[PDB]
Amino acid sequence: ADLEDNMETLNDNLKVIEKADNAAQVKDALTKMRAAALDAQKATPPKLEDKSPDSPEMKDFRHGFDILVGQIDDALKLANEGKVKEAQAAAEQLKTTCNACHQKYR
Amino acid sequence: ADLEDNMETLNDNLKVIEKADNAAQVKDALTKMRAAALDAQKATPPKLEDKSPDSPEMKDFRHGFDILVGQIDDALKLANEGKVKEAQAAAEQLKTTCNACHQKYR
Numbered sequence: 001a002d003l004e005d006n007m008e009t010l011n012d013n014l015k016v017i018e019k020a021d022n023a024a025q026v027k028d029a030l031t032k033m034r035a036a037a038l039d040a041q042k043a044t045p046p047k048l049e050d051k052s053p054d055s056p057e058m059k060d061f062r063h064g065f066d067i068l069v070g071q072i073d074d075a076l077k078l079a080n081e082g083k084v085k086e087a088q089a090a091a092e093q094l095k096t097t098c099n100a101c102h103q104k105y106r
Numbered sequence: 107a108d109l110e111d112n113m114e115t116l117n118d119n120l121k122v123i124e125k126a127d128n129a130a131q132v133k134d135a136l137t138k139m140r141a142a143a144l145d146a147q148k149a150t151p152p153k154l155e156d157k158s159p160d161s162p163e164m165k166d167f168r169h170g171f172d173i174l175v176g177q178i179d180d181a182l183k184l185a186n187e188g189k190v191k192e193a194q195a196a197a198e199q200l201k202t203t204c205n206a207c208h209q210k211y212r
């Protein structure tokens with residue numbers, strides 16, 4: 001689940017509690033709210049994306065995608081020309097980049 | 107989409123390109139890979155989670171959930187005693203915390 005999912009879980013269960021019939025129901029809803037709150041707590045909300053400094057490691061991580069996008073663009077130009085086979089070969093070269101990042105950060 | 111979703115989109119579309127029928131298909135796959143790469147780029151990968159400082163803003167953001175969990179726990183104790191009505195009233199007080207965070211970070 002992502003932050004958005006967790007908020008949906010919070011909102012849904014709050015409404016359940018408002019319409020709740022008995023203690024068991026309220027307990028069940030509150031328990032799920034607690035877990036969702038703690039999962040949401042670990043996320044970076046969209047409004048604070050790009051507002052924090054990146055570590056050297058985080059900078060290198062993000063740089064891997066700049067490499068990948070450059071290679072995707074190379075393949076994309078071939079696809080737009082209609083060179084199916086050469087676009088498929090260019091895609092295969094992406095795997096080098098995929099693997100390099102994984103080895104460091106997965 | 108979170109990082110894990112984006113990687114699934116990358117992996118799926120890479121395989122599509124390998125088995126692709128035509129130029130339009132390869133183009134569609136590559137376009138989605140480019141967007142997924144750029145969406146993934148904004149994430150913090152799990153291996154670098156506990157390795158980065160939180161900004162003052164990020165610290166305050168996370169603190170909001172500690173407040174919420176404390177209030178959920180207050181309501182939960184009432185639910186476990188069987189005080190349905192008082193547990194429902196305690197849940198309503200959560201909304202103050204919900205709203206405060208939203209006003210700052212949503």
Ligand code: HEC
Pocket residue numbers: 003004005006007008010011012014045046167168169170171174200201203204205207208211212
């Ligand atoms: C500490 C911060 C914080 C608290 C506490 C919090 N929220 Fe949110 N909530 C957010 C942020 C940030 C967003 C925007 C997320 C986004 O843009 O993807 C959000 C979005 C939402 C949304 C929009 C729809 C969705 O699925 O994302 C709803 C509904 C929501 N919150 C409900 C609640 C409810 C109900 C509570 C309390 C029981 C609550 N929130 C408590 C930070 C918080």
Ligand code: HEC
Pocket residue numbers: 061062063064065068094095097098099101102105106109110111112113114115116117120151152
């Ligand atoms: C610059 C970094 C980086 C690049 C580039 C990258 N990956 Fe990943 N990939 C990751 C990380 C980090 C994870 C771990 C995700 C997690 O735990 O949330 C991951 C996870 C995955 C997974 C595991 C399943 C999933 O959905 O998370 C697959 C499959 C995957 N990547 C495929 C690819 C493919 C295919 C490419 C190239 C087209 C690629 N990756 C490029 C960093 C990268």
Ligand SMILES: [Zn+2]
Pocket residue numbers: 001002039
């Ligand atoms: Zn999660």
Ligand SMILES: [Zn+2]
Pocket residue numbers: 001002108109110111
């Ligand atoms: Zn996920």
Ligand SMILES: [Zn+2]
Pocket residue numbers: 001002005
């Ligand atoms: Zn989801």
Ligand SMILES: [Zn+2]
Pocket residue numbers: 004005
């Ligand atoms: Zn969702």
Ligand SMILES: [Zn+2]
Pocket residue numbers: 107108145
């Ligand atoms: Zn996304």
Ligand SMILES: [Zn+2]
Pocket residue numbers: 107108111
């Ligand atoms: Zn998803």
Ligand SMILES: [Zn+2]
Pocket residue numbers: 110111114
């Ligand atoms: Zn998935």
